[PDB]
Ligand binder design. Structure first.
Ligand code: SF4
Ligand code: SF3
Length: 553
């Protein structure tokens, strides 16, 4: 196999036998074949748009297919086989439409050779062998490989956010068109300039999509507000919801109301606690545990059903007993888990089986007590802008440090905890994404009532952090966003973080520290382009990085 799309990739080079995440060769290869088929869809879809007869019938399929290949999203080879077969059928429909339109517009049959992605077909028994030759290593040149895979990795992250927006009824044609432009581009022989421009365009589309998702989440569930979230437990059986999807949360809360089953969040569902639409339910207890990588013991000790709405779901340890109460939904899949089918148009998912099972479970084992404060998304922070601006001009706040992104397993991530602990007492940490769990249970206090850790929400709520920076740029009358008293020390793991990074680069943010390592999918020459254009940096020691950040470097 070959996969290098996450921070934990083997030797920071690539997983070649079995993924460090647990992904077996067969699964890895099937994900490659799915992406191959999506490239085929894209070739015809792009051509149809160019001919003035766009077909948007595959929009959701494309988003879901990309999302299913995110790290820790889908482990079920049966699901991939089904998606690949469906993809081939969708592709062939587009092919036939294209051929007819091309002939009408040109007065002759289409005759140009196409990449194999556009033409190869087989039944499911042919997939395993074909998959071996259509993956990342099919691109021989390391710079072409790096730029194509950077694009697809960023694109998957964008697709995830676009899927959540689509679930909520929010779509933009430009996003779905760009999915096909980007995918099709990776079958073409393009210059480095063209390939880099596509990556920058993806960053701009990450801005568009993150804005759309922010609109969707806040229009539907309200603006996040300051909330104190309990991290202890009650004495009722509960259902633990993890991942990111807020519509699943809305439906789970409605369906559990009055049943005697409590609802708890986990991981990237913590920010559901911040939304007024959800705060109204008394049986929504709070948040259980930490970030995704601790889930084996935590899902175990929770005792009730666990619902994974998105990544990250990790393989069960052999000693874990929660498979029989593990539920997947959306793009998530896991062999032997129970999957909750997609909602029908105008309807709702059916969580009744989780509720019935939860009534037979003991309540959660308490693993800590206390609280986490959050809800500082853009409406909330902009409301406080006068107070923040006066604190900066008076010197009470010397600097903001953006420490958003993803958590993960590697012990080097103690860096993030130590930075939070050792930053001067006149700084404020801004966060979003599960990177927060390295420092959100500390006792860092406040500056004149502004907490020293401001949690804007999920990784997608990095959007709020960008909105806040842009607003402060205006209030302070600065010409360059980088001259704000803000430093960026971002942790990354999976592909949504790459989308966020590309958005920040598109917005012109330079000097970002990215860690705890730099992506394996940046070739030396491509890394040089990013350093030259954007001054991206690796992490150093805690002491050195704090000093440099306080100096604005
Ligand atoms: S998702 Fe990450 S750990 Fe898993 S196979 Fe790919 S690079 Fe390796
Ligand atoms: Fe939405 S941030 Fe990226 S790592 Fe897996 S849930 Fe976390």
């Amino acid at each position: 196999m070959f996969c290098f799309q996450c921070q934990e990739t083997a030797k920071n080079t690539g997983c070649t036998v079995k993924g460090m995440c647990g992904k077996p060769e067969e699964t890895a290869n099937l994900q490659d074949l799915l992406i191959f088929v999506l490239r085929g869809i894209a070739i015809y879809g792009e051509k149809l748009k160019e001919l003035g007869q766009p077909d948007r019938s595959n929009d959701d399929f494309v988003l879901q297919g990309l999302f299913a290949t995110i790290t820790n999203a889908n482990w079920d080879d049966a699901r991939f086989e089904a998606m690949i077969s469906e993809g081939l059928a969708r592709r062939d429909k587009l092919r036939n439409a294209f051929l007819a339109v091309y002939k009408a517009k040109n007065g002759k049959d289409f005759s140009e050779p196409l990449p194999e992605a556009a033409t190869w077909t087989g039944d499911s028994t042919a997939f395993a062998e074909k998959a071996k030759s259509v993956g990342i290593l099919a691109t021989e040149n390391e710079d072409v490989r790096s730029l194509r895979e950077l694009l697809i990795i960023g694109l998957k992250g964008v697709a995830a956010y676009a899927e959540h927006a689509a679930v909520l009824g929010f779509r933009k044609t430009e996003i779905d068109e760009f999915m096909l432009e980007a995918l099709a581009s990776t079958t073409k022989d393009l210059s480095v300039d063209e390939m880099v421009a596509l990556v920058m365009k993806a960053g701009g589309m990450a801005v568009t999509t993150m804005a759309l998702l922010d609109e969707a989440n806040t229009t539907t569930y309200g603006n996040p507000e300051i909330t104190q979230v309990n991290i202890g437990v009650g004495k009722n059986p509960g259902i633990l919801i993890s991942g990111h999807d807020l519509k699943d949360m809305a439906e789970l809360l409605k369906q559990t109301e009055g049943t005697g089953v409590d609802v708890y969040t986990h991981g990237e569902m913590l920010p559901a606690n911040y939304y007024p639409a959800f705060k109204k339910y008394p049986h929504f207890v709070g948040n259980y545990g930490g970030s995704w990588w601790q889930q084996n013991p935590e899902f175990e000790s929770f005792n009730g059903p666990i619902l994974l709405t998105t990544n990250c779901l990790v393989p069960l340890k052999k000693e874990n007993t929660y498979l029989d109460r593990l539920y997947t939904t959306g793009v998530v899949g896991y062999e032997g888990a129970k999957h909750i089918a997609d909602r029908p148009a105008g309807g709702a998912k059916d969580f009744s089986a989780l509720i019935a099972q939860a009534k037979k479970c003991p309540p959660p084992v308490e693993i800590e007590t206390g609280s986490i404060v959050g809800g500082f998304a853009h409406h909330q922070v902009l409301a406080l802008a006068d107070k923040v601006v006066e604190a900066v001009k008076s010197g009470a706040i010397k600097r903001f440090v953006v420490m958003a992104g993803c958590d993960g397993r590697q012990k080097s991530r103690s860096y993030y905890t130590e930075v939070a602990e050792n930053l001067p007492k006149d700084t404020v940490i801004l966060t979003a994404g599960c990177a927060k769990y390295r420092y959100n249970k500390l006792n860092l206090g406040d500056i004149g009532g502004i907490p020293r850790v401001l949690d804007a929400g999920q990784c997608n709520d990095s959007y709020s952090l960008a909105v806040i920076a842009l607003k402060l740029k205006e209030v302070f009358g600065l010409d360059d966003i980088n001259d704000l008293p803000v430093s960026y020390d971002i942790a990354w793991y999976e592909q949504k973080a790459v989308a966020v990074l590309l958005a920040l680069l598109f917005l012109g943010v330079k000097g970002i520290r990215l860690g705890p390592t730099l992506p394996a999918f940046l070739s030396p020459n491509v890394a040089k382009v990013l350093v030259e254009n954007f001054n991206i940096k690796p992490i150093g020691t805690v002491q050195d990085d704090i000093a440099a950040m306080m100096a604005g470097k």
